[PDB]
Amino acid sequence: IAPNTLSNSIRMLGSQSPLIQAYGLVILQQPDIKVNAMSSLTNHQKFAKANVREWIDEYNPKLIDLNQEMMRYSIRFNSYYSKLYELAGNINEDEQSKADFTNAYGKLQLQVQSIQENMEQDLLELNRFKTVLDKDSNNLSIKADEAIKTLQGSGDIVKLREDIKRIQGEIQAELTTILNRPQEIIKGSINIGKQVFTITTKTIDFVSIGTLSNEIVNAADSQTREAALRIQQKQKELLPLIQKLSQTEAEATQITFVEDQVSSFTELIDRQITTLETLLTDWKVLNNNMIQIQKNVEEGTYTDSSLLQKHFNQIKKVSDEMNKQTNQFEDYVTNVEVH
C-alpha cells in the first residue's frame, strides 16, 4: 500500500470546483435570447440553464458530502491509530488482543466499504446527468454550425468564430493552470463580467469570466501571475474580433457565445466526473488492500506482528494524506469565491 494510493484526486475535485461554478454562472447570466436564424437556440439555452441549476442543486453537493465523509473517516482512523497500532503488535501475544484488533479494524474497513458504496451510487447518478449534458451540448454545437453556415453569406464569419472560440479555450486552460498550482494558503476570487457591443442600432451582450482577484494577479508564484497576465491580454484580443463578427452578422455572435459557454462548462463537468471515477478506482484498491490485511490476520499469516504494524502504518500514511486533501478540497470550495 503506497502512501500515494489515492493520488491527487480529492484535492483536484476541490480545485476544479470554482471554475465549474464560474463557467456555470456565465451561462446563467448570459441573457435569454431569441435568434431568427436559429429558432432552436432559445430552447437549447433553456436546457443549458436548467442543466447548470441541476448541477448546483442536486449533483455538486454529493461531491461536498463525499468529501466530508472521507474527512470524518480520516479523523476517526487517526484517533484510534495509537491503540490499534499497539493491539496490532500484540496479536500473537494473546488470543484476546487478536480478537480486539480484528473487531476494531473490521469496523474501520466497514466504514471504508460504506464510503465506497456511496461513491459508486454517486457516480451512477452523476453519469446520468453527464449523459444528458454531453448530448445537449453536442446537439447545440451541431445546430450552431448549421445556423452559422446559413448566415455566412459569400469565409469571413467562420474564421472570426473560430478565433473567438480558440481564445476562449486558451483562457479556460490558463484558468485551469492557475487552479492547478500549489497554493500554500488557498484564497482568491473569480468575478464574472458583462460587456456590451453596439452595431447598426442594436446592442450585443457578452458575459464572461472577467477580473481575477489580487491574490492571483499579484501571486508570488511567477507561473500563476504570468498566466493571469496572459488571460488579461486575451480578454482584450476578443474585443475587435467580436465587434467585427457582430457588425458583419449579429446573430452569429449571439449564437457563438451561447454555444461556446455551454461547451466550456460541459468539458469541465466531464473532467470532474472522470476525476471522481479515478478516485473510486483507487479507493477500491485501498479497501481491497485493507480487506486482505483482515483475511491474513484471520488465516494466521502474521506470525510476526511487526509486519502487521508495518502494514498498519502504511494505512496511516494514506489516512494522513486523505485528511490533507479533504481539507484542501474544503478550502477550495470555501475560500476561492465566485461572483
Numbering used by the authors: 16 to 169, 171 to 216, 222 to 360
Article sentences:
The NheB and NheC components are able to bind to cell membranes, whereas NheA was believed to lack this ability, despite the fact that binding of NheA to NheB/NheC is thought to be the final stage of pore formation.
We report here the crystal structure determination at 2.05 Å resolution of NheA by selenomethione Multiwavelength Anomalous Dispersion (MAD). The NheA crystal structure shows that there are eight copies of the NheA molecule in the asymmetric unit. There was no evidence of oligomerization as all eight molecules of NheA all appear to be monomeric using the criteria of PDBePISA. Excluding these regions of disorder, the alpha carbons of the eight molecules superpose on one another with an RMSD of 0.3-0.4 Å and therefore can be considered as almost identical. The tail domain forms the main body of the structure and consists of five major helices designated: αA (Ser 24- Gln 44); αB (Leu 56 – Gly 104) with a distinct kink at residues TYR 95 and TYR 96; αC (Glu 110 - Leu 166) with a kink at residue Leu 141; αF (Ala 271- Glu 319); and αG (Ser 326 – Thr 355). The head domain includes two long α-helices: αD (Asp 172-Leu 195) and αE (Ser 243-Thr 269) separated by a β-hairpin consisting of two long β strands: strand 1 (Gly 204- Thr 216) and strand 2 (Thr 222- Leu 233). The structure reveals a similar overall fold to B. cereus Hbl-B and E. coli ClyA, but, unlike them, its enlarged "head" domain displays on its surface an enlarged β-tongue which is of amphipathic rather than hydrophobic nature.
